[model samples]
Target: ATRLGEKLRDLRKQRGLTLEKLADMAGLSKSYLWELENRESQRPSAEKLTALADALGVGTSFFLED
Candidate 1:
């Protein structure tokens, strides 16, 4: 969902972590993270979502909320 991407960017900044740092922490590529943040069509898989959630100190459900 695009809203998931938006929430991701918001949480990352709220945590004072750059996209690069978040990507590193989540063991993901920077380009993918950039796409998720800037491109509405990019839908991350569950594994990727979980990785991001964990890295962001949040639960996977965070991205599932309305």
Candidate 2:
């Protein structure tokens, strides 16, 4: 979960996007994304990750980099 969020954050930063905007684009709740990014939560659906990757313009492997 942290890996996924870190990847999302990094990709979003690289693309000059904000969390709220990216979450909206990815069809995720901001708080959910926030928890994921902060490593406060450790579980998210695979489909959710796919949507996030799509919105972030990255592959799913981006979330598995660690």
Candidate 3:
């Protein structure tokens, strides 16, 4: 099983989004997404997580409970 970081990176790539692109869409910093994708940090706040899900057209649970 993958951590949420891995899960996040996979889906981001699946959707053809670069870290900068996804960050722009999600209203997050590119560095933040980079660290998250590289598995160098903990889960972000629910608000940020929700933004990422919304941008990626995925459910927050897809990164969490799923």
* lDDT (Cα, tens digit) per residue for candidate 2, span 10-40: 8888988888987888788898778888775
Model 1, runs deviating above 4 Å: none
Q: C-alpha displacement of 14 in model 3, angstroms?
A: 0.9
Give the TM-score ranking, best first: 3, 1, 2
Looking at candidate 3, what is the lDDT of residue 1?
A: 28
Candidate 3 clashes between residue pairs 3 or more apart in a chain or in different chains = none
| CA-only RMSD, every prediction | 2.0, 2.2, 2.0
Candidate 2 pairs with clashing backbones: none
Alpha-carbon runs more than 4 Å astray in model 2: none
Residue 24 lDDT (model 3): 92
Q: lDDT of all the models against the reference? A: 0.85, 0.77, 0.84
Clashes of each: 0, 0, 0
Q: TM-scores of the models, in the given order?
A: 0.82, 0.77, 0.83
Query: lDDT winner among the candidates?
Result: 1
Clashes, model 2: 0
lDDT for each residue of candidate 3 in 39-65, tens digit (9 for 90 to 100): 557778999999999877889898887
